[PDB]
């Protein structure tokens, strides 16, 4: 009937015409209201393969947040190739909300309903809607914020999971809360619970041994890079704040190894900077300094980006390390369930 | 494509090199970059790669903490430190782009001219 | 992710079909790719994904195989493919083999 295609899709939201927060408004115009009681359909007898690394709406969504990016917050100073831009440079509201994507007429969005699901390969019970679910682009390195939560087991996916080049994400089943600061008006931290932390880490180190065998799994720091992607780096009230995960990317886990082992709070040092790099392009942006007061804001982790070290292979232990940087493999995290075709 | 790289340089055991591997033809930002070194006669080593666009780094088994793989956004230029340089650390060094775009596929196209190194007090 | 060449080397007079062997650990699919180099020069990618050609040198190379053992052939041997042979699966190489001629 169908074969696949690619072609330009629109976006859907509930964003408030009146609010001045800048998601609020580029969406207001950007994107149509999104529908009271949405449609999914379960395709009876229907098989069907997907991949969340070639699926062009990551592409598409890529796009478009570049573009809410651009004409939101708009830096002191560009230096986009070797052309350097001055301009005005107004502080703004700036906090994320749900965004559905909608396949237009003649065209339909897939969706898989098997449990953890990878990303790859072929679908036992697929349906078909209308629109995704509503989806909070959240621009973060290392830890994914307010994305969606694995049913029952914690997923992993990855293009090569034996292949170190490849990025790896990691889904969690239940959120690790973080929580964020800023009382040096550039110093801040962030706070999350150890106990609740260690759980995830454990259980994350047995799901990893399922890909790499009956192993000893590492977690450790990242190996270099810029600020961005060596630190959980992320946006808070048009703020960017850069914080160290060090604390929490420390640890050896044996197969036999229990969080309970040998405040109960993990606290991560952050830093607020003005000079960064963009992730939508090559080169550095520069913004005006933070803005007085007391700046909050309470996260949920829902997910990992690691990576896995090369070397001559060795058996009993592999180590990761936080990574990411590409902000594809954030959408991806979202989208990895929903494919495009054409009919 | 096309990948020049540093002159032969030669080094006093225990100090450190940095060689450079100077980008053009073809788009820095989208293409990963791998470090080898080949022993006198040996077959190549893999020593790590870097995804350019934000430094993106993986050192490998023996050599971390005494490699650092940098780049420098402008110009273009990628790097390859190593530190501590042991007698049988002298070879020559390589960069090698992966020739997928947006990907990994460890094809690896254009090669640099190879830089002598030799470690000798 | 490990590799074994045979042979180390070879000697084979201008014509001789060629044929080399790379067998590895369990199971890389057709991941396996060919490389070429010359005395003080830096290798050259010749075949790819196990069985596929590349733009630039002939297709009289070429390779099959799948799952452990793969195999690389020269049909018609020249006088400048004279050089040294490696098989790579992403940060693993092969012994190489050091080709030549018969005398």
């Known amino acids: 009937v169908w074969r696949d295609a690619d072609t330009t899709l629109f976006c859907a939201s509930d964003a408030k015409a009146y609010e001045t927060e800048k998601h609020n408004v580029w969406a207001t115009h950007a994107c149509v209201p999104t529908d009271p009681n949405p449609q999914e359909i379960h395709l009876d007898n229907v098989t069907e393969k997907f991949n969340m690394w070639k699926n062009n709406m990551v592409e598409q969504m890529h796009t478009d947040i570049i573009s809410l990016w651009d004409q939101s917050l708009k830096p002191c100073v560009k230096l986009t190739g070797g052309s350097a831009i001055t301009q005005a440079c107004p502080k703004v509201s700036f906090e994320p909300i749900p965004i559905h994507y909608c396949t237009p007429a003649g065209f339909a969005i897939l969706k898989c309903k098997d449990e953890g699901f990878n990303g790859t390969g072929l679908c036992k019970n697929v349906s078909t809607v209308q629109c995704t679910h509503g989806i909070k682009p959240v621009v973060s390195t290392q830890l994914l914020l307010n994305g969606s939560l694995a049913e029952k087991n914690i997923t992993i996916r990855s293009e090569n999971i034996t292949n170190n080049a490849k990025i790896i994400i990691v889904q969690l089943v239940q959120p690790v809360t973080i929580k964020c600061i800023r009382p040096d008006i550039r110093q801040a931290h962030c706070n999350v619970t150890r106990s609740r932390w260690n759980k995830t880490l454990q259980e994350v180190a047995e799901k990893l041994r399922t890909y790499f065998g009956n192993k000893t799994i590492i977690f450790a720091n990242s190996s270099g890079g810029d600020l961005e992607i060596t630190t959980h780096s992320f946006n808070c009230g048009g703020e960017f704040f850069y914080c160290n995960t060090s604390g929490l990317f420390n640890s050896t886990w044996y197969v036999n190894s229990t969080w309970n082992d040998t405040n109960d709070t993990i606290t991560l040092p952050c830093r607020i900077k003005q000079i960064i790099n963009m992730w939508q392009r090559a080169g550095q942006a520069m913004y005006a300094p933070p803005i007085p007061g007391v700046i909050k804001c309470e996260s949920n982790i829902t997910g990992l980006l690691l990576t896995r070290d090369g070397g001559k292979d060795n058996n009993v232990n592999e180590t990761f390390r936080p990574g990411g940087g590409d902000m594809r493999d954030n959408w991806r995290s979202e989208l990895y369930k929903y494919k495009v075709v054409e009919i | 494509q096309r990948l020049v790289q540093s002159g032969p340089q030669v080094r006093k055991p225990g100090s450190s090199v940095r060689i450079s591997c100077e980008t053009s033809g073809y788009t820095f930002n989208a293409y990963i970059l791998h470090w080898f070194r080949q022993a006198p006669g040996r077959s190549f080593e893999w020593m790590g790669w870097i995804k350019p666009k934000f430094g993106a780094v993986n050192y490998a088994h023996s050599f971390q903490g005494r490699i650092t793989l940098t780049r420098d956004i402008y110009r273009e230029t990628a790097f390859l430190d190593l530190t501590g340089l042991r007698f049988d650390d002298t070879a020559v060094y390589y960069c090698?782009?992966?020739?997928?775009?947006?990907?990994?596929?460890?094809?690896?196209?254009?090669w640099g001219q190879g830089t002598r190194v030799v470690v000798s007090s | 992710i490990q590799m074994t060449q045979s042979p180390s080397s070879l000697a084979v007079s201008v014509g001789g079909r060629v044929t080399i062997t790379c067998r590895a650990s369990?199971?890389?699919?057709?991941?396996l790719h060919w490389y070429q180099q010359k005395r003080g020069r830096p290798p050259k990618i010749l075949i790819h994904?196990?069985?596929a050609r590349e733009e630039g040198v002939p297709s009289r190379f070429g390779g099959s195989g799948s799952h452990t053992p793969f195999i690389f052939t020269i049909n018609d041997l020249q006088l400048d493919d004279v050089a040294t042979y490696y098989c790579?699966?992403?940060?693993?190489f092969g012994q190489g083999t050091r080709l030549d001629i018969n005398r």
């Open positions: 790579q699966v992403i940060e693993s």
């Open positions: 090698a782009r992966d020739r997928l775009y947006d990907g990994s596929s460890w094809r690896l196209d254009p």
């Open positions: 369990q199971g890389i699919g057709s991941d």
């Open positions: 994904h196990a069985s």
